[PDB]
């Protein structure tokens, strides 16, 4: 059985939460980068893409598409999805809030220039008034090092990845949230995450204008 | 002890897939309809909405927000989430396709009249050229009555809900997809689903301009 092989553009977009989770889990993977519309159309025409889209991951005999299908499978396989049905409800609730905020961040570079200020201001408002208070409250309420079950789960990994993007956006947004600051440091120091955070890993950068244009070209 | 209680507007939107799944699982539930901004504020103020949003379901002593958290819990509890990690992977892939389509459909009534025509045209095109082909191909690959593991799962339920909606929208779209038609018929005839499909059940109508205006009136009174 192979290393999982990740099909996506050479950028963050919709594959980056899978790169984080696999790296957090200590799992070696390979990437086949889509550089053109022709690369994508060949995957489609070869029947690799159930819904004609990427992300797609080749893992344990499957060609899985859909971010959540990929991540649930990885989380479940590497015991990062809790130990029972009630922990999974907490985990799902948390990571779905993270996905919603995440989505706004992923979509942001693609919005018309005249809308950016308004959209960014709204993401900053939701971070401050909605999402950071929600997660700080979880940490504050049980006083434990991990969001759920007193042990590392995907929710920790997904949230910390998000705290890194929020820092790139505005380093002060986290300032009033000391338990989130502390979660970020703790998880960043786990050997697997520490290595993924270091130069030269598969961690992808923020999108620049050449990438924004390229992603269009790939559609 | 208590029935699940579903906190939403009195219409489909983001709660309908849950009404379908619970009914398919044989679970009677209650609904508490949010009618005003006051009602929404009370749920928030009581601290029952983790991200200040609905849907919310009170089930088994918990208050579950996020549509997918709600559905995953229900599907796991009532054995509609396949039998192993690999079946769940197939289930999740299939149903996330449905969710992408669903998300366009649910937002359609709150589009400006100017974007509506094109949005609808796009929806139909994706049904016909992307999603119905994908699901037909899966049913054809194995010739079995159910999408995954040759037994009823949440994927069948969520697909068939989608097929009922697509029928309302344009009843010709399914015409080229004989295996989807057959699945729709089989699943519709299962005791629990048949009961949910009957007149007078909790199944909700398609949204009308009053539902739309109630939703706006709640978020922007
Ligand atoms: N719900 C899907 C969304 C995938 C998606 O939007 N994919 C884009 C690339 S980021 C794509 O393949 N676009 C081509 C298309 O939709 O026609 C997932 O989470 O994987
Ligand atoms: N990802 C969430 C989205 C929920 C959502 O957007 N709910 C809307 C109403 S249908 C809401 O409460 N909006 C008010 C707000 O976001 O302030 C889910 O699937 O439950």
Curated annotation (Swiss-Prot), chain A:
Cystine crosslinks: none
Residues recorded with modification N-acetylalanine: 1
Stated family: Belongs to the GST superfamily. Alpha family.
A single GO BP: linoleic acid metabolic process
Organism: Homo sapiens (Human)
Protein's UniProt name: Glutathione S-transferase A1
Gene that this sequence comes from: GSTA1
Domain annotation GST N-terminal: ranges: 2-82
Effect of residue 70 to A/V: No significant effect on enzyme activity. Reduces protein stability
Record-listed N6-succinyllysine modification sites: 3
GO MF, one example: fatty acid binding
Keywords for this protein: Acetylation, Cytoplasm, Isomerase, Lipid metabolism, Oxidoreductase, Peroxidase, Transferase
Annotated GO CC locations: cytosol; extracellular exosome
